[PDB]
């Protein structure tokens, strides 16, 4: 028994239903992590969709809040801080087709790609695909041939073709196809089509996850 | 030649109780000692778990007893063959749990967290207990052998034999069809919905698997129950059976608590790895 | 910091009348609220005491179940409402904050108060050694009581409290549990005790030091002041 | 230039100037230091239920 | 002039304090403490577990009083816990979650936090309002913060994630001096006994004494294989402790320069976390990547105990300043006191 403490025991009580509380509240919502190679591709996506080190962005899209976070902007090596998104729903590769002609730029999207994906602490948790600038990659295509930085392409200089041939490069550096799946989305300057493109990836992965909770997925 | 069937029928009850105590412990210590494991989905796992406790713990010995023959009360053997149905009936129920939060989670893209709190799965596990108390004390106030005869309520003690106390229209028509055959049925639907629509969702193989896994799911549950529910069924419509077929039957139908561990807990991925690190440790 | 009572006045026998306080600059649903009301003569007296949750409501033997004492945090005000009170419920009520944690320092804020007049055993006995006291400035008084039971809990701490009333203000908190001094206190103060005789020890008395010293102690929620210690400059 | 290695050069000067004093006179500090306050340590020396704070 | 001049001129200077060392070194420090009695077995039982968190808990700091501790988790909250009754004396709601360190002033009036946000934040305890509020914001930093440590009420040490520390006024909230020797990012801090000196590790796997007042680097250490994660000084103030991810620790004396012994054993293949010293500083208690926390000898080096407690990976690590029981905590959001 006590006299004072007593009333400690009653505030420490309320400070945890609160702590519950935003415990609860933090879990409704989806949490999001925003990277990839180059700003240009990642500052468009994050004024897509919208109400120092890091960047918090919130935006609500039919009923549910996304919180997507940017860390270009620390400039640190990422194994000593990126276990801290260990947590996260998915992560949002944004990167620009057109650095295939740009300096080789591709070669380091893809290291990025690869070192991201196959990463231990992002073992479960997918990646958004991303793959901006579509206007100005098919532009590009009629001008100088794919086969810049991809000496093994062999094909027709269209668009659709070499955004098939991208896209499936970039998905093939996954090392656990069992366990991840990459959705890849080309965009540019467009409208509501990329938040809904990403709710529609998030809503999949939550029911994916759900479903591995209780071992159906 | 009756004696060594009705002690094998013994042996294999107390064998599939041991069985299905190890395996129900194991889970629930596997489920405890690793609070990661403390999400809703364990909550129905846990419920599970307990009432396969339960039946291994005293539908089993009581079971026994019931064959054995007794010269008790026989509002003793009654209560005794109401609690004996009252835990495969909550075991039951707990399936039935299990195949509805499976439904929401399916049918609810993104609204299951929010929709299924801790108070509601809590108050659903409640109202699933209480719902198999209910049902399964039903022979004792009025539903019992005293209704068919004059006769029966004039005898105070009499042998201990199932077909003694409990009465085989109730055994058939109300258990059978209200609580086997109506979950079944309602879970083999939710089974086949959720299957289609993951064969929607995913096409945009894996349907194997998914068949298979939700597959054995709803037919071990058949194995356990409906031997059984027809062996009561053509023995209420002037029916003959041997001694091994109908205990054969009750042995399908206690299988039940020592299978559903292997069937749903080692299925999940996260228990399934922490149950492999333990018994490595341990 | 600020508290302001309302709810005053006449009143006959027998009525009833609801006293407010608004509170305003600092957390009132963090802190824990206290009524304590001052007869025109006689000491200070606990009334009855709130919690930050609104519960755990507990009111002393002589006004329990005639008052009532409710909080509204949304809207950041105190609430006590007296019902059929008695002639004998005369008294100035002064409201008290309260906040408690391990060095917290509770009551260390009370109200202006406000003057209500009707129209015509089991707690810790806190027995004043002397009412007056004869002080000068520059020299030192020692102010002592005597407690029912030895106020050391079995944490160590000892539940006892100072208050000094100045003549036109209320009662404000200078030591808490015998030990700490209360912010915005001088220094010059020094209380101690060995749980059943304390001593209240005032160097360099100055001028603002005149006043009454009411003692409190907090073991037993039935709060008990004592008789208070008046000390002529 | 001289921005990153001039002033690495005149780091390593001042850190080679720096008196120093033998490792066998630092272990026996050390251990005198470790010794002296032994009894000071509840994590070293068993330490009773009764002072123990956090008992039960 | 040219830079091979200045490359062989560093290289030289390298060479010449490399034979200083060695002729210093006449001896190593395993022959000279093995004629102390080892201390043994040390069995600890968790007397209090704390379960308010629900995140991974990253950093915790034990108060002057030696009851009181703030724990850093990044759900957003900094706990005040009452190790005694294990009850909340404050929850903060912090600004940014991604938190990874935090302090506790020794006059227990303030308490900072940091992390990923480059900007810190002094929040201050006693105010007469009842309610945590932040008092200054120190937004000078580049880089994600990752160690800070109060030298007073009005200074205080932080570390960023680039090569550079700072101490900043919390007054005005500037820097004062700021520290940029090192190469790598600095992980870890830790203050002198006399508030006089402090060493800093980063990833470089070099450790630099940099003194609070002068801010000239005196000695570096370059004894370690990687990146070294955690720091500690021994409590008189002549000798730190250093934990990398490499499971190797070495002890460092300010007095000889160089690693005196090395801690580390062919089971234990995972990175250390956090390292602390007991009061008489015979005992070292390191967290390591793994779920367990082993006691090892601050002169014999042999394990004295393990506190496997935990099921996840133990972030952080203190010791109470009277010695009485260790703190540690893990990234499953729970926070135990051993004893
Ligand atoms: C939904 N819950 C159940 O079905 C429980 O009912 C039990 N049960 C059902 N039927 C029987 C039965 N048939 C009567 C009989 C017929 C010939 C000879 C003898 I001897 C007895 N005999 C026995 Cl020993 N148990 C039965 C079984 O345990 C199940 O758990």
């Known amino acids: ?217 | 030649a009756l004696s060594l069937a009705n002690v094998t029928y013994i042996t294999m009850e107390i064998f599939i109780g041991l069985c299905a105590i190890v395996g129900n412990v194991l889970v629930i210590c596997v489920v405890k000692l690793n609070p990661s494991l403390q999400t809703t989905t364990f909550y129905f796992i846990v419920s599970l778990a307990l009432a396969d406790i339960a039946v291994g713990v005293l539908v089993m010995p009581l079971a026994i007893v019931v064959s054995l023959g007794i010269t008790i009360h026989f509002y003793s053997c009654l209560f005794m063959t109401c609690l004996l149905l009252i835990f495969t009936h909550a075991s039951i129920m707990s399936l039935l749990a299990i195949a509805v939060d499976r439904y929401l989670r399916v049918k609810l893209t993104v609204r299951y967290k929010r929709v299924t709190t801790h108070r509601r799965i809590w108050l659903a596990l409640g109202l699933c207990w209480l719902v198999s108390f209910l049902v399964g004390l039903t022979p004792m106030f009025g539903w019992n052998m005293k209704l068919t005869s004059e006769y029966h309520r004039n005898v105070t003690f009499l042998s201990c034999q199932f077909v003694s106390v409990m009465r085989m229209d109730y055994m058939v028509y109300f258990s059978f069809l209200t609580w086997i055959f109506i979950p079944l049925v309602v879970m083999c639907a939710i089974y086949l919905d959720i299957f289609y629509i993951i064969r929607n969702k995913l096409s945009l193989g894996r349907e194997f698997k998914t068949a298979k896994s939700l597959f054995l799911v709803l037919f071990l549950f058949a194995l356990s129950w409906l031997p059984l529910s027809i062996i009561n069924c053509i023995i209420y419509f002037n029916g003959e059976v041997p001694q091994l077929v109908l205990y054969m039957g009750i042995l399908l139908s206690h299988a039940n608590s020592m299978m559903n561990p292997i069937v749903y807990a080692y299925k999940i991925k996260k228990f399934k790895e922490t149950y492999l690190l333990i018994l490595k440790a341990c | ?233 | 230039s001289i921005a990153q290695a001039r002033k690495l050069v005149e780091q390593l000067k001042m850190e080679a100037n720096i008196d120093r004093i033998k490792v066998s006179k630092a272990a026996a500090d050390l251990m005198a230091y470790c010794e002296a306050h032994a009894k000071e340590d509840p994590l070293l020396t068993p330490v009773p239920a009764s002072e123990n704070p956090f008992r039960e | ?339």
């Open chain 5, 1 to 339: 002039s040219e830079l091979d001049q200045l490359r062989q001129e560093a290289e030289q200077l390298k060479n010449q304090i490399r034979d200083a060392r060695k002729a210093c070194a006449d001896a190593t420090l395993s022959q000279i403490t093995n004629n102390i009695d080892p201390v043994g077995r040390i069995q600890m039982r968790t007397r209090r577990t704390l379960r308010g968190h629900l995140a991974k808990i990253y950093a915790m700091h034990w108060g002057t009083d030696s009851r009181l501790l703030v724990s850093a988790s990044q759900d957003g909250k900094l706990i005040i816990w009452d190790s005694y009754t294990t009850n909340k004396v404050h929850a903060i709601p912090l600004r940014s979650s991604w938190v990874m360190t935090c302090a506790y002033a020794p006059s227990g009036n303030y308490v900072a936090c940091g992390g990923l946000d480059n900007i810190c934040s002094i929040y201050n305890l006693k105010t007469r309002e009842g309610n945590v509020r932040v008092s200054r914001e120190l937004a000078g930093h580049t880089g994600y913060l990752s160690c800070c440590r109060f030298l007073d009420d009005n200074q205080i040490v932080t570390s960023s994630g680039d090569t550079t520390c700072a101490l900043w006024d919390i007054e005005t909230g500037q820097q004062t001096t700021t520290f940029t020797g090192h190469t790598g990012d600095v992980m870890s801090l830790s203050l002198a006994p006399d508030t006089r000196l402090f060493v800093s590790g980063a990833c470089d796997a070099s450790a630099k004494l940099w003194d609070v007042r002068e801010g000239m680097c005196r000695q570096t250490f370059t004894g370690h294989e990687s990146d070294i994660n955690a720091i500690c000084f021994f409590p008189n103030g002549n000798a730190f402790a250093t934990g990398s991810d490499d499971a190797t620790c070495r002890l460092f004396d300010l007095r000889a320069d160089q690693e005196l012994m090395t801690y580390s054993h062919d089971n234990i293949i995972c990175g250390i976390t956090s390292v602390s010293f007991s009061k008489s500083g015979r005992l070292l208690l390191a967290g390591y990547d793994d779920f367990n926390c082993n006691v090892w000898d601050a002169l014999k080096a042999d394990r004295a105990g393990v506190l496997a407690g935990h099921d996840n990976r133990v972030s952080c690590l203190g010791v109470t300043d009277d010695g009485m029981a260790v703190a540690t905590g893990s990234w499953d959001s729970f926070l135990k006191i051993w004893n």
């Open chain 1, 1 to 217: 028994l006590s006299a004072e403490d007593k009333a400690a025991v009653e505030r420490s009580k309320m400070i945890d239903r609160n702590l519950r509380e935003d415990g609860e509240k933090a879990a409704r919502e989806v949490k999001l992590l925003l990277l990839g190679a180059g700003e240009s591709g990642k500052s468009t996506i994050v004024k897509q969709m919208k109400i120092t080190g890091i960047v918090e962005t919130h935006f609500t899209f039919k009923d549910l809040h996304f919180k997507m976070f940017d860390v270009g902007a620390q400039r640190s090596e990422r194994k000593k801080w990126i276990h801290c998104f260990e947590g996260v729903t998915a992560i949002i590769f944004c990167v620009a087709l057109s650095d295939y002609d740009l300096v080789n730029r591709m070669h380091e999207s893809m290291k990025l790609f690869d070192s991201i994906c196959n990463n231990k602490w992002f073992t479960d948790t997918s990646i958004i695909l991303f793959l901006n600038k579509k206007d100005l990659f098919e532009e590009k295509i009629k001008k100088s041939p794919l086969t810049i930085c991809y000496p093994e392409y062999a094909g027709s200089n269209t668009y659709e073709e070499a955004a098939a041939y991208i896209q499936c490069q970039f998905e093939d550096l996954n090392k656990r196809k069992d366990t991840k799946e990459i959705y890849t989305h080309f965009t540019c300057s467009t409208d509501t089509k990329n938040v809904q493109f990403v709710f529609d990836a998030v809503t999949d992965v939550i029911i994916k996850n759900n479903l591995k909770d209780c071992g159906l997925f």
């Open chain 3, 1 to 233: 910091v600020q508290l302001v009572e309302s709810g005053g006045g006449l009143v006959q026998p027998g009525g009833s009348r609801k006293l407010s306080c608004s509170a305003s600059g600092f957390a009132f649903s963090s802190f824990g609220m206290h009524w304590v009301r001052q007869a025109p003569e006689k000491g200070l007296e606990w009334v009855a005491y709130i919690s930050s949750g609104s519960g755990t409501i507990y009111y002393a033997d002589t006004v329990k179940g005639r008052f009532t004492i409710s909080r509204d945090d949304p809207k950041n005000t105190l609430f006590l409402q007296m019902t059929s009170l008695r002639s004998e419920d005369t008294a100035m009520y002064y409201c008290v904050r309260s906040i408690y944690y391990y060095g917290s320092s509770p009551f260390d804020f009370w109200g202006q108060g406000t003057t209500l007049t009707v129209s015509a055993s089991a707690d810790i006995v806190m027995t004043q050694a002397t009412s007056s006291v004869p002080v000068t400035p520059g020299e030192s008084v020692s102010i002592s009581c005597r407690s029912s039971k030895s106020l050391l809990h079995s944490n160590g701490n000892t539940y006892l409290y100072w208050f000094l009333q100045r003549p036109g203000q209320s009662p404000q908190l200078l030591i808490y549990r015998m030990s700490n001094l209360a912010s915005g206190v001088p220094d010059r103060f020094s209380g101690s005790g060995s749980g059943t005789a304390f001593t209240l020890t005032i160097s360099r008395l100055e001028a603002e030091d005149v006043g009454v010293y009411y003692c409190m102690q907090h073991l037993e929620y039935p709060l008990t002041f004592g008789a208070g210690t008046k000390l002529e400059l």
